[PDB]
Design a protein around this ligand. Structure first.
Ligand SMILES: CC(C)(COP(=O)(O)OP(=O)(O)OC[C@H]1O[C@@H](n2cnc3c(N)ncnc32)[C@H](O)[C@@H]1OP(=O)(O)O)[C@@H](O)C(=O)NCCC(=O)NCCS
Ligand SMILES: CC(C)(COP(=O)(O)OP(=O)(O)OC[C@H]1O[C@@H](n2cnc3c(N)ncnc32)[C@H](O)[C@@H]1OP(=O)(O)O)[C@@H](O)C(=O)NCCC(=O)NCCS
Ligand SMILES: OC[C@H](O)[C@@H](O)CO
Ligand SMILES: OC[C@H](O)[C@@H](O)CO
Ligand SMILES: OC[C@H](O)[C@@H](O)CO
Ligand SMILES: OC[C@H](O)[C@@H](O)CO
Ligand SMILES: [Mg+2]
Ligand SMILES: [Mg+2]
Ligand code: NA
Ligand code: NA
Ligand code: NA
Ligand code: NA
Ligand code: NA
Ligand code: NA
Ligand code: NA
Ligand code: NA
Ligand code: NA
Ligand code: NA
Ligand code: NA
Ligand code: NA
Ligand code: NA
Ligand code: NA
Lengths: 759, 759
């Protein structure tokens, strides 16, 4: 109720409002950002410092890719916000500083999540774990991983082993949390700590009055931990020579302060996805002020952005080989949401929207940060074309439907976590649930719950379907039965996981940058959607004959006649896919969840398409045992054969209404199919996306689109001569990877996917 | 469903029943023990080994008493069930083995409960804490103490500071848990582990079905921890050369196995009271079998009992000087419940009941174990007289009302935790709550919530009582108001404490020896009952004039006229005390509690009578500022002046019905007042207790009685010449202490208490 000297100086010239009296970043942005409708002509190139710095770091990246292992990692230090000393690439050149450990790309040990995983990584990468670390996290501090395995059921373990429910967050950080790092820059740490003490105190009455007693005690302790984490953030920044007690006073500080908030997160937690948020336009407010004051030049502004983004290209976590199979390409998902439109109709695109995209030119293509364009048919044409140009040149961007999500939330300050999962910044988070194998679940329906590979009873004992010809109605009725069972086992596993993650690895530093009460969804994913839909289609429109072994188990199938396949705008099969999405959503919706997190669904797989595919036998659609499923909501490899419009249309039909956690689609088109020359390609790509994302009362539109503009021949050359493509980046599931960071098996998945040859 | 070879051999000759098919220790006792109605004539004396062993240990005890500090303690090892190597007094002589650390009386560090307390002890006793221990329990493993202080309210902190609610379990183990250690001997560890896996599995349906989701996950993890603790118990015993996977096969093993169960508890938890249970009669089953088989002699049987009891005299915990003021005399409360009657009318007194009492002769008087006689008017006269004789000779026993408690529980296998708090063994526990200052609460009523010493607003702001003469009705109405406030702050503090103790120091090894579902009570204690009652009496029957300072604060009082004081069988004041007990019980009964633990109350103080007394100013009864309150439910020092029958009658009036956690009374009578000679004293003491404990439909009877038979002159001699009384033991609050273990201030409290001079 009285802004001190620190706030005064930092906020000079800013338009006043609620944001000055309470934590309200959206209000600050709305009252202060400058919409930009111009083009990319104002952009500056890289400075010598930026190039010197990145070229050096790329040598570490090349090492990671050729060895498929970390450059280095700790074996005796438990990482915390303050554990490591300041680390640099070259202190004399960096404009934005901060590394997870004391050296670039050196990975930390984050033991609160589990000790067995660390032991696994040490063994896999030939390093010796310090016995003290093992002792502490086995006998003194229990871990998330052990808490989960102490409470799991034999049933869940069988599902994990058989490949029907595998890769859940029981052995790595859950992630899917985006603290509002912008708060550090806007308010400074002290202001945020005072606000947290007020939130803590606001719970005293309920505590004393016995209102939701356990929930109140839990939340009060969580807020105390958040407050403590904020204090540690100041100590961390001080190691780098910065005092962040007060708000950032200029562009360099706003960028640095925001990054420090994120740095505390990645020093303390190892969530699968550690997304950055929606920061580019927020940061433009500070950049614009300094530019107009003549304090910095445009090239200096681009340099600060380059150094921040460079640090986001350097986030690393020690993972096991098992994790590497589920989440390939050394992903981080430092996702940044760019542009979009405000509820008031103004565009939220700023010059900084262009500066972030420009990092793909100043420092070349890179898979991280995961730059995500919030697309609207109303975006400035200049921006639509520049983003299209950047996709054509680098294949490093993804696009999501702002015309769909902004109205769904009635909010213009939501960001994307990981790949396609939206959340209002600082007010919402997801309880990550990885994804379930829907394709194997169908086989279980046909085989009475017996696994086709292990020949073990995994699902409930049921009568296997008899006959020489499968009947759609019968198969679907049994499938519906096993989806009920799948939903219950899935939610039960997630209930245990998130109870334990809250208990043993509560993300204090990230939650410290959220409101007191955060909305939580229980995000359930489904893998193999197109395999399941196409399998039902073959059964329904063709004659599928089961090939059984001496036990009556259907281990293969023979199909007589053609059948419609997902991705060709044929309602006969597309309707089946839509139905599966709706059906599973309704089943998880009926189950009780931990902390009453609202169940949501995503059609997303990351590399579980390969992992589940390896553990799944021959399916009714004709897919061979061991073969990968499509990534996310994609049609199966090479089955979408009618062109871009047709496949984009099939995918857009999937209902975001029943998959609020997101629907991932990876679209790859050859340059000449997209257009005859550069200008036409930009226009055509922007046009294709406007059509795909088109939204009106009666048309939902697609939700997400990864865009690769490349010739398959070029990838083949890269597979043979990796040294020639050190920064080659490709979109693969709702995020990007450097092509060279993948294993050969994962590259084979990618190269055999659909390369669209026509509109 | 099929007893293996191990059970067969161990249970040969035992009468069969449910106990062989499920964990049911009571059933085993009922079907196998031998009631003993004879006298003490069969008792054997100490062996040379016993005397050699105890004489050596007493040198360590003398050292503890003269230095008022530990003989030694760990500074770099975090204690767990398996952390320490085997330790001995003299391995060649011990028949029952096991020590907490590697050396007799060396105290451990049990950090899960809090690190600041350990730092405090290191500083107080001039030892240096290993920096690694401090680091681990500050940054990696959060402690119970820090969890509590992170969630406390400013109000609770003010109450702690002012002395109205101080000494609660926020800085030491809560205790008040008695695992059924007899289970280890009866079933062996493997059987108990299989039973725990079955309990764990029985919760799967509720987990999957979303029934009380969080409670189910919590309990499943607790059972997993219990199972793990049982496994560790086997490793611990193996360090001593014993395989306890199977049930005990003879008397020595039954005693050893039972003790190992208890040893795991005191190696892993530092609860204020770590009581032993109700084991003497259970152990007699094994002793009797070996005696009849000619396997052991009576002297060998007494020797095994002596060595077990000797180990119970050696339990130690590292405490802070602050703890020492609240719980004086280096207490452990290794309470053992002896005798009693069964629901079927048979006495549960056995020859072993006599052997346990005999340890006070074989190894002399000792404050631990805290031997507690479950008294019944129907006990064999031979036992009544021997117990009376033991009290006359050693003042080391306490007595509790079996005719009251057995029918209340409708159970004959309940034990006493700490001093006077009953629980059905293996089925019930208490959430310890220490005690509240009822006397200071009365001053707050008179002073508008302002503390009479700190001159700070602690209670809610209220109008201080005006006038030159206090009026009972007005004072009582305000007091009732502040008791409401006291109850709410008290229960709120305990709710936080037990939520945090369950989270950060769950007593796995003790809970592993309980049924799946344990009944929990929230035990609230009240200190200063007689001060409050006498204050109301003075106000009601005399003329009490407040002496106020320049602020209107009543800092002293002048009383004109006599008034009845508690402890003289005068209903005018005794009724006031009864009312206060009922009144507070009804107020705590209305509040929500953590885990729905049933609120109960005890009139018990331990040394809080001295601590609260030091922090309480002059009271209306005439007590001077800083003076100690009476211990437990005792009349104030020297106010009970009408003889034993009169004071015993006043105390017996206090309603156990509203104080189910117990009512403590410390009775000290001079030898010649008790009787002219030994035989008459025994008869008279037994007679006094029969009268005090007399129970019928319309008469509840007293609940507890500490009995000291000594001349005050002897204590004065001991205060001057401590070297002359190395084993002198005295009952002081519901437990005993070696007189020399007390500080001078605590000795002054004891010596100025009432020494009854007549019947
Ligand atoms: C440090 C804290 C306890 C307040 O300290 P304070 O102003 O010095 O409080 P008090 O004056 O009441 O003293 C605390 C007492 O508890 C004792 N104590 C025991 N364990 C303790 C612990 N873990 N932390 C702090 N004090 C502790 C102190 O030594 C002191 O004893 P004393 O009165 O004999 O000297 C602070 O954690 C607090 O206010 N906690 C309440 C909950 C809270 O604010 N949580 C953070 C919300 S964002
Ligand atoms: C050890 C335990 C997991 C079962 O082990 P198991 O019979 O070998 O189980 P599975 O065959 O399903 O294998 C467990 C899998 O989880 C992995 N794992 C990851 N973290 C683990 C952890 N903390 N503990 C055990 N396994 C772990 C194992 O490496 C293995 O992976 P894999 O299939 O690729 O080899 C046991 O803790 C258990 O049954 N837990 C369920 C709950 C329970 O019984 N609690 C105790 C009740 S008293
Ligand atoms: O630890 C690095 C991973 O093993 C590699 O797959 C990253 O591309
Ligand atoms: O060894 C028992 C501990 O509680 C372990 O389970 C966690 O540290
Ligand atoms: O640590 C020992 C205690 O300080 C002493 O009071 C015991 O009598
Ligand atoms: O170890 C417990 C601490 O509070 C930790 O969570 C932050 O430093
Ligand atoms: Mg295993
Ligand atoms: Mg303090
Ligand atoms: Na390079
Ligand atoms: Na940290
Ligand atoms: Na809770
Ligand atoms: Na942490
Ligand atoms: Na729901
Ligand atoms: Na749609
Ligand atoms: Na088009
Ligand atoms: Na001695
Ligand atoms: Na232990
Ligand atoms: Na719970
Ligand atoms: Na423990
Ligand atoms: Na109640
Ligand atoms: Na009574
Ligand atoms: Na008598």
């Amino acid at each position: 109720s009285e802004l001190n000297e620190k706030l005064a100086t930092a906020w000079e010239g800013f338009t006043k409002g609620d944001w000055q009296n309470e934590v309200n970043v959206r209000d600050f942005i709305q009252k202060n950002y400058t919409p930009y409708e111009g083009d990319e002509s104002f952009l500056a190139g890289a400075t010598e410092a930026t190039t010197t710095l990145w070229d050096k770091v790329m040598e570490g990246v090349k090492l990671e890719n050729r060895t498929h292992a970390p450059v280095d990692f700790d074996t005796a230090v438990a990482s915390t916000i303050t554990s490591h000393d300041a680390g640099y690439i070259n202190k004399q050149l960096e404009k934005i500083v901060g590394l997870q450990t004391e050296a670039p790309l050196k990975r930390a040990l984050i033991p609160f999540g589990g000790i067995k995983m660390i032991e696994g990584s040490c063994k896999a990468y030939n390093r010796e774990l310090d016995p003290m670390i093992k002792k502490i996290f086995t006998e003194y501090r229990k871990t998330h991983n052990q808490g989960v395995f102490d409470v799991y059921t034999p049933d869940i373990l069988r599902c994990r082993k058989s490949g029907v429910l595998t890769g859940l967050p029981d052995a790595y950080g859950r992630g899917r949390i985006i603290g509002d790092y912008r708060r550090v820059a806007l308010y400074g740490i002290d202001y945020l700590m005072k606000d947290k003490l007020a939130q803590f105190t606001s719970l005293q009455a309920d505590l004393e009055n016995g209102v939701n007693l356990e929930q109140t005690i839990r939340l009060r302790e969580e807020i105390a931990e958040q407050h403590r984490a904020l204090g540690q953030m100041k100590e961390m920044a001080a190691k780098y020579g910065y005092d962040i007690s007060g708000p950032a006073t200029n562009a360099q500080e706003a960028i640095q302060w925001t990054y420090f908030g994120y740095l505390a997160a990645v020093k303390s937690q190892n969530g699968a996805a550690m997304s950055f948020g929606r920061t580019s336009t927020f940061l433009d407010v500070y950049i614009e002020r300094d530019l107009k004051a003549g304090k910095i030049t445009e090239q200096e502004a681009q340099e600060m952005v380059d150094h921040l983004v460079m640090k986001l290209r350097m986030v690393r976590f020690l993972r096991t080989p098992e994790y590497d199979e589920l989440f390939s390409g050394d992903p981080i998902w430092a996702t940044e949401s760019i542009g979009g439109m405000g509820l008031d109709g103004r565009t939220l695109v700023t010059k900084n929207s262009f500066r972030f995209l420009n990092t793909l030119y100043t420092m070349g293509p890179s898979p991280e940060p995961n730059m995500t364009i919030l697309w609207s048919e109303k975006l400035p044409l200049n921006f639509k074309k520049f983003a299209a140009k950047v996709s054509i040149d680098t294949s490093s961007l993804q696009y999501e439907n702002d015309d769909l999500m902004r109205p769904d939330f009635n909010n213009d300050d939501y960001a994307i976590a990981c790949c396609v999962s939206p959340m209002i910044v600082g007010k919402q988070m997801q309880f990550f649930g990885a994804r379930a194998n829907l394709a194997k679940t169908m086989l279980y329906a046909i085989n009475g719950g017996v696994d086709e590979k292990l020949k073990m009873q995994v699902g409930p004992k049921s009568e296997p379907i008899k006959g020489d010809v499968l009947n759609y109605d019968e198969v679907m009725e049994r499938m519906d039965h096993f989806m009920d069972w799948l939903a219950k086992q899935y939610i039960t596993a997630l209930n245990i996981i998130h109870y334990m993650h809250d208990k043993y690895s509560y993300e204090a530093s990230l939650m410290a940058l959220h409101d007191r009460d955060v909305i939580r969804t229980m995000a359930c994913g489904i893998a193999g959607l197109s395999v399941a839909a196409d399998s039902l289609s073959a059964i329904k429109y063709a004659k599928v004959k089961p090939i059984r072994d001496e036990d009556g188990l259907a281990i293969d199938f023979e199909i007589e006649g053609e059948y419609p396949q997902f991705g060709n705008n044929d309602p006969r099969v597309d309707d089946l896919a839509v139905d599966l999405v709706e059906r599973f959503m309704k089943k998880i919706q009926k189950l009780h969840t931990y902390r009453d997190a609202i169940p949501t669904q995503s059609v997303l797989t990351i590399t579980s398409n390969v992992v589940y595919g390896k553990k799944t036998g021959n399916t009714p659609d004709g897919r061979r045992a061991g073969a990968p499923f499509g990534p996310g909501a994609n049609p199966m490899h090479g089955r979408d054969q009618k062109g871009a419009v047709a496949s984009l249309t099939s995918v857009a039909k999937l209902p975001f209404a029943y998959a609020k956690d997101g629907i991932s689609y990876t679209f790859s088109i050859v340059p000449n199919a997209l257009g005859k020359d550069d200008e036409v390609r930009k226009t055509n790509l922007a046009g294709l996306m406007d059509g795909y994302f088109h939204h009106e009362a009666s048309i939902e539109g697609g939700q997400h689109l990864n865009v690769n503009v490349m010739n398959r021949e070029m990838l083949l050359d890269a597979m043979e001569n990796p040294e020639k493509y050190p920064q080659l980046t490709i979109r693969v599931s709702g995020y990007a990877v450097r092509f060279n960071s993948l294993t050969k098996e994962q590259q084979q998945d990618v190269i055999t996917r659909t390369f669209t040859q026509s509109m």
